[PDB]
Symmetry: C5
């Protein structure tokens, strides 16, 4: 026996707020007059599909990183200076950033402020994001490359690993520049994104919880599905579509048969395990299809 | 274990469909057999193995669901010169749909040209357009416009054409950051413009178990609402193609409640993102194919 | 559970198939075993695990299906100068097929040129054609033609060459919007032209359950009809390739099983058959160079 | 329900395989265990979960299969000037194979050049060649050649190099239409030219249910797996990876020894083994699944 | 029937793993639950659903495995002028690995340049190098070098850099055919250079059935060897990326189940291990920025 349950959420300006400023969590109450399941049977739950049409996800989270840029002199053979990359001007209230151009601007302003006293404005290097290639780029003069190197610390080195590097120190590495415009060997947006996965969870649905580590552990958490997210490009706004294939093992046992209501909520888990709820926009449309399959 | 396969097909012509499909005839099939289809002692599941909607027409855009507004900002005086609501009424068909993204771009452009009429000199009027080859919208401007003015997109414009670079200025409006004569999107956004969500096969008289639905009443939460659906095909708009040939090939089972039938109807239906349903209709050139599998447990 | 695999092959040559496969010999395989294939005590499901139609020729267009018409509009006088039906009769072989999209483009171009022969000067006659590289049709015009006139497509032409930009004048006719000297399609429309729907393996003497089909009559809905179908491969015309090498392999956990009814047999025939969109069936014919592989599975319950 | 996995591997060296695999040592593994593999009471199915043929060499062409012929037509006189057969014998190895599509393009070009040697001058001799970048064969000509002459392909050339535009003059020969200096193919046709049909793992001593084969017939042949090979590019040396309901019945559950070979079937069905190289590292993972 | 889901995650920092992961701490996690995990009466299978090795370093080349040799040939005198062995020792790390194909290109180049020292002019010395953009090795030469000489690759080089156009002269050595200033490979060969074969999850103290391995010894061809393996991720080197973010999800190849032998347990240890093509094993090691995620399915029968 296959029991199918469709659900939808609309939105508008009045429910969500301008630019979704009310941060209303994505949630649906399911509520039926009749009972949903047959008392004499045992049911596995699986989420067959969902569609998160028109939502806004963050692209970068400064708190998790400790970036540091520096300048190295080739004649004198020493470190001239090192500065910490200051994101506080570009961050929203919740500690997020929504554009990889701005990650590049932050890194650039730190780099420009460091070379203010030391190097002439003609040769101050420029760090920027290229919208077309999805790659960060370093733009420099020939005078700069003969005189100096740009230095990255390890956090920078790892997240922007597609540049060519030379290790000088336990921490710091030199960026090897051979041309006016130097770009990344490969995109590294996967390394920058804080989003790990999006999850459907219910406080009141009688379903066997998944086993977790501690905040030794006896900890548990309700998870109906587990969507792994990957930042493909610089798109702040997204339309995320999920559909299972022929033999997905992603079932969950239902412990009690007799219920006529429950709540479903969409939540985002970051790479540092800070969970936060997915919120509506005026234009958001959410769709959802649960299967209850008898054993 | 038993595999009963039921093929079915619809040919079309000008008589059935009308010129350009103007009769709006629903896609539908009666399957009528002399013998009974299923064996009385078994229980069966139903899955749609494949279908083909060869030569059909689908809408590319539905203006009713959007509130697009463009505006001009003056950098010298640092204030809003005007804001106008984009008017799609001269581009829309009788059922509220549009069928070309070049036309979506023209609609936006004419609003922009009307808004700039007295306020900016003709040579410096910016041009909004859809690029057929890249499937991206573009803004074309003079350097003299860029030094003087910004184009303003409201929140709905902001979201649906999100791959331009923006700068917020208040609760509602956002400035389009232009640095070159031709400025284009970083990424196609046709998925944000299409109104078509899914195509569904349904039936009024096939003895098959319903799916549970949220209530018809949009305010109330309680629901005893159901509906027959045999399959659920998610549609994604890949490009600027009005006319399509949709092909589907195959967990998606449905229980058959009673065994004693030889008649049923099948109808293809389109659901939009605003949940309004409407029938898939024929063209003269439409050919439709369909394959059901009744599978015994 | 039991798995009984049955590999099979077909070779060919000039004598068997004829020059360029001109004898039209159907692809057919007598399987014949000395021993009985299946064990009497068990029930068996049949699935075609893979095949390979190496080096065959399929048609790309079938003029019978289509009612193409082109016209010329005059923008000065704002009326139709003329309209003509597109005639393929010279390009078509015996069977009613065409085998190259360059020819499809030529036939439309001829019709268009013959329509402009009296009226418009030879220097700015428009040129319809098929671009081999992009797999897209193209309209080549002069600026003088564009200012003066429009090319008209009818409803059938409109649908099958849908990627051009169009303005609809009438219930029937549409004007092709041209802004530049060489105008092309937004997207490939070869899927709208290929007459091949699917390719089928059917046996005239294998004890296997038949698929239910709709009635032969256009007038009656009540159906008794049935057909033998072992597999049903959906074909899609990717490019302008006349000759093809078609390979099918069953994905993990498909449902394309048929019940076998009788458990006692040691011979059966397998033909390969092509269905078109108009439901006209015709057999897959050999070439001299045609190798054909095939692999059935008989799976017990 | 029981899953019993059997990892296996092969290594190699100069002394085992020879310079450029010149010994032709077949790929083979003797599995031999102290304990009995399977339970005596149960029934088992055999599926090959994954194999990796790392650093191997496979032929790209086999002239034996093909009967190519080229010709020159004259447009002024309107008649066939000559027809020569394409001789591959200079580029072929001992086993009848060829290992690069540029050499396939050269062989046809030498035949084409030899046919125009007496008739047309060197300035207008057409040039047949393989483009390494596009994976497509090209015909280079002059304007003087195109106005005067055509190039004739026979039916076997016509089917394997089908992407060119053609005009049929008779039952065997077809003119290649040419409008520019460098004319090329509509699409890649390496799938036509490759003689490798599939790659098979076959035993000679394992108790497993055989697959029914043709010859009236009563033949049978043991095959543990079947990998369908397709030629993606002009890469002579390869690294073939396979990961997976391709099951087989194990007839007897009392054994602890068998010999797994690797074999290459061609489109003419002529079978031959997969030979090692010094650098080769072959991997394999069988599954025994219970009922 | 029952589906028990076990989630596990690992974080890191400077103190834990060391600057650039200098301490080489292996990736390992202890699962310790106060309750028993499984129900006594049922029989459970184990499959790994998904893991995510976020921000980790992996080697791209392992010189020990190869014996590369380069040579110079003289076209005038028609003989070998010399053959040097490619020395990687100045580029390798402590553990025998190289983390950049640019550096593999330089190694070959230094060897090639040193071999031309006495014999060829500074301008006409050929240059071998890796192209970051195309992922292909290139040979930059003068017209004067090509008219006078050829570069010679031994068999090991010939295989791993097979996409150049070669010509055999003897059993070991092969000329590289060069017709332009810059000559590139026809296709990528990074698959031929990577030493990482697969990444593996294993456990010393989980009661689960072991897989059957071949013999440790060269002498006795008979085997008795077994190993504990929870999953087997086949790795493929896409590009020149030193640092990686490896995601696995069981979508297809879902046969990778393992029989749990004992139901009575509440604790085990999961460790990540890398196997190379010479079958040497070494652990996966953390970095300060590494985050590892894991999900296990215990499924009953």
């Amino acid at each position: 026996q296959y029991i199918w349950l469709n659900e939808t959420i609309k939105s508008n300006k009045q429910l969500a707020g301008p630019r979704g400023s009310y941060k209303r969590p994505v949630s649906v109450d399911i509520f039926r007059s009749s009972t949903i399941l047959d008392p004499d049977k045992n049911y596995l739950l699986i989420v067959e599909e969902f569609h998160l049409h028109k939502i806004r996800l963050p692209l970068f989270k400064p708190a998790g990183h400790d970036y540091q840029v520096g300048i190295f002199n080739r004649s004198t053979d020493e470190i001239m200076g090192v500065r910490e990359v200051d994101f506080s001007t570009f961050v929203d209230e919740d500690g997020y950033m929504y554009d990889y151009v701005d990650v590049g601007t932050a890194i650039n302003e730190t780099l420009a402020g460091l070379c203010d006293g030391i190097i002439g404005e003609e040769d101050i290097p420029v760090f920027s994001f290229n919208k077309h290639s999805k790659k960060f780029e370093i733009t420099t003069t020939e005078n700069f490359r003969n005189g100096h190197f740009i230095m990255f610390n390890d956090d920078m080195r790892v997240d922007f690993n597609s540049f060519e590097f030379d290790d000088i120190d336990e921490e710091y590495s030199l960026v090897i520049l051979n041309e006016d415009v130097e770009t990344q060997d490969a995109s590294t947006l996967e390394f920058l994104t804080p989003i790990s996965h999006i999850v459907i969870e219910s406080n009141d649905l009688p379903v066997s919880y998944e086993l977790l580590p501690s905040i030794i552990s006896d900890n548990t958490g309700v998870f109906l599905t587990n969507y792994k997210y990957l930042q493909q490009n610089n798109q702040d706004y997204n339309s995320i579509l999920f559909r299972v294939e022929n033999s997905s093992n992603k079932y969950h046992n239902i412990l009690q048969t007799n219920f006529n209501r429950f709540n479903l909520s969409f939540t985002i888990y970051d790479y540092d395990n800070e969970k936060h709820p997915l919120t509506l926009l005026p234009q958001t449309v959410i769709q959802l299809k649960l299967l209850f399959e008898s054993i």
